[PDB]
Amino acid sequence: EKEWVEQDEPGVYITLTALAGGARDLKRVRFSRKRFSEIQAEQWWADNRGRVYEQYNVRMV
C-alpha cells in the first residue's frame, strides 16, 4: 500500500494512497499555517475539491 505526499499550491500538501498500483485514494490534505488561516483552508477545499480529485486521479464518489 504505497502512500505519498504531493506538493499542490504553496502551503498545500496532499496525501494519496494506492495498493500495488491500483485505484488511488485521497487520505488527507495538510495546510501550512504559514499560508492558511482556518477560514482560508475551509474556503480552499470548497474551491479546489473537484480539481484535486481530477488532477490526482481519485474517483470522486
Binding site: 485521497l26 487520505k27 488527507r28 490534505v29 495538510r30 495546510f31 501550512s32 499555517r33 492558511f36 482556518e38 483552508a41 475551509e42 477545499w45
Partner: peptide, 16 residues
C-alpha cells in the same frame, strides 16, 4: 468526515 483537525501549531489537517 471529512474532519478538520486544528490541534497542531504548524498545520491544519483535513482528514478525508
Amino acid at each position: 468526515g471529512p474532519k478538520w483537525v486544528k490541534t497542531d501549531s504548524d498545520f491544519i489537517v483535513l482528514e478525508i
